[PDB]
Amino acid sequence: PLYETLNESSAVALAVKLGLTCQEIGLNYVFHIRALIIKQAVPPLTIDRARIESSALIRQGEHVPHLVPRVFYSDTEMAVTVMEDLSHLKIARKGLIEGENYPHLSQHIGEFLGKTLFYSSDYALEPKVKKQLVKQFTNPELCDITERLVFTDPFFDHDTNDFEEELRPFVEKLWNNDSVKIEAAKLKKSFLTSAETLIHGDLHTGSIFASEHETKVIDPEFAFYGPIGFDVGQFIANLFLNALSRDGADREPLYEHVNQVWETFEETFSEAWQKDSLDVYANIDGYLTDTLSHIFEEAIGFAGCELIRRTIGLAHVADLDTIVPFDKRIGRKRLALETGTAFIEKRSEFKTITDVIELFKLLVK
Amino acid sequence: PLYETLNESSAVALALTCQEIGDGNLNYVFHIYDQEHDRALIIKQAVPYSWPLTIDRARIESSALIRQGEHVPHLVPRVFYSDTEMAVTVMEDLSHLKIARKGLIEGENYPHLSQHIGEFLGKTLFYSSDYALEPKVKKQLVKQFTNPELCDITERLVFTDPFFDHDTNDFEEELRPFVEKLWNNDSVKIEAAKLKKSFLTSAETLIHGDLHTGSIFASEHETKVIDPEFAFYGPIGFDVGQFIANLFLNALSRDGADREPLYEHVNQVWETFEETFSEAWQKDSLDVYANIDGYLTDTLSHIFEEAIGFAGCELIRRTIGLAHVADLDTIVPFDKRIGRKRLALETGTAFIEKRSEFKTITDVIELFKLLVK
């Protein structure tokens, strides 16, 4: 077997053996070594995610090379990906909580979303080509994490949930809500079955490096063929999660980001569709429009699952957990549950991104 | 390479007397009949040398038949042996039965056809879905049953070509005015496109993929579903819609009160499907959501809507596309044939456009009846 777990010394040796000072800065080792990053999966989760991540980064790079790190080398057996150093940037979630507003974040992520999502779909690819990519990017273990954490466990009294006792009354309201859970189920069924395009699968503010002028999407290890709306919904939900961690007028930049990411996505996806669709149906008046309306509806539903899941599930976000004082934290966490719920149940009622934003604003006053 | 094309002698050596009896031209079917006992056997083999198609479909077909046999062994031929590289499937002889399409055109009513097909549909469709399987297991089955070439046939012929002026279409000049009407109908074509997009993307369960009346052997008391070579992970409503559409295609070839058994079959197949799917759901779902009141109901409404849309595609596709059905082509006289073919286009279009408005299977039957008066 070719697999050996790396150390600072074997990492530098490998960088040299490929012709391209070391500190481990990381389930994953990250070796920072001009500069370079050598990422390695450690063996509970398969090391195959490293193959997915590298391949997904490379596919993303054909369309948006400026929005993802460049990959210099990958090895499936060693579960290694050698890539661009982005140390000089900050994780978007961390920056946002510190009060950075990143003026271009939404334009950049909108463009990422519109191009990555269009160009790996049946709209852009011969069906026989896409069917082979579905096989290639099948990702059963990482999908399992999402299927459980985003779509199932928050909605029942399951072991993996993690929430304050003061939140219990509002958590049990959700658990006892048949109609929202039926909707969560439909959304999970779409996640399980709708192999529409190659998605990132975990596009939150913690999977983005940012400065004032730059944006880079990282860690596409959850990538697989899933619904187009999913990456869009998770990103939007994480902007709303940051809004909830802020007060008053300080929220406005995040609402502007929600608006702008949808707008840029819709326009980027639309330009790509007009220019590069292989589909004889693509040019029929109203088909692109109805396609977008369905992406929009799903995205809002997936945003609501992400709002709820991050509040009471196993994997929390720092936006909510670091809110002080404690009583303010409980209140804002109740609102994340309630807005997430409204998003899920009302997803088909919204006509524009502005309606989504205005409903959110109303609820969180 | 192990592949060698069989002949009558080769086939007996592998497995008395042997006759090649293949219906199409893409497959050999060797019937082997013995006289120690009056026992018999079928050796099917894919021929490479027609739509150009690889011989891999033989692997899909045998695998699909074996999977179906786990849940409905009484509704599919038994498989005794299969070989991927030889593209061979050795299976149960069903020569004593009649192709259902042929029998229906002859005026056979097959009282149990819909009961049996409904059960086939409910069990095959449920037990290969995420409702019944661990998602990690189902995901490996999606890979195993990936069927790009046969899917491409359907994507073109069912979902695309009839709706534009494409070279695969085949229709009488008398039909042209009504055909051009369809091509110019933006709103129905947008709906066909959505249905196609579900076909391309909704990997919900292992489907048969070509479940028409020509893919069924029948007698008064027996029904067997054959030729699952188009099988892949696709939308649950697809097999349901194709079958139903082919019942309606037969009703169109009939006159007056003779149509009633076919209408009863449409009613019964939906009802048995829904019942069967529902019983399987109750007893064998792995999903924590499965018993929340209204979830099975909404899931069925979606299956139903898609089924009716796919039925409409099939109604249109069989009328003006590359692959016709004997129900309509053998209608006499010629003027009556043109009239009934116009109606298949019209009912197919209505099904597609109105699919979300129907509440029950009887709504669909009653609309069809009105349109075909």
Curated annotation (Swiss-Prot), chain B:
The UniProt induction remark is: By starvation.
Q: List the disulfide bonds.
A: none
Q: In which pathway does it act?
A: Amino-acid biosynthesis; L-methionine biosynthesis via salvage pathway; S-methyl-5-thio-alpha-D-ribose 1-phosphate from S-methyl-5'-thioadenosine (hydrolase route): step 2/2
Q: List residues binding ATP.
A: N27, K44, E92, D93, L94, D227, P228, E229
Where does this protein hold substrate? D210, R317
GO biological process assignments: L-methionine salvage from methylthioadenosine
What is catalyzed by this enzyme? 5-(methylsulfanyl)-D-ribose + ATP = 5-(methylsulfanyl)-alpha-D-ribose 1-phosphate + ADP + H(+)
**One Gene Ontology molecular-function label:** S-methyl-5-thioribose kinase activity
Q: Tell me its EC number(s), please.
A: 2.7.1.100
Keyword Magnesium recorded: no
What general EC class does the enzyme of this chain belong to?
transferase
A Pfam family of the record is APH
Q: Which InterPro entries match?
A: Aminoglycoside_PTrfase, Kinase-like_dom_sf, Methylthioribose_kinase
Ranges that cross the membrane: none
Q: What does this chain do?
A: Catalyzes the phosphorylation of methylthioribose into methylthioribose-1-phosphate.
Name the HAMAP family on file: Salvage_MtnK
Quote the subunit structure annotation: Homodimer.
Query: Which protein family is named in the record?
Result: Belongs to the methylthioribose kinase family.
User: Mind telling me what this protein is named?
Assistant: Methylthioribose kinase
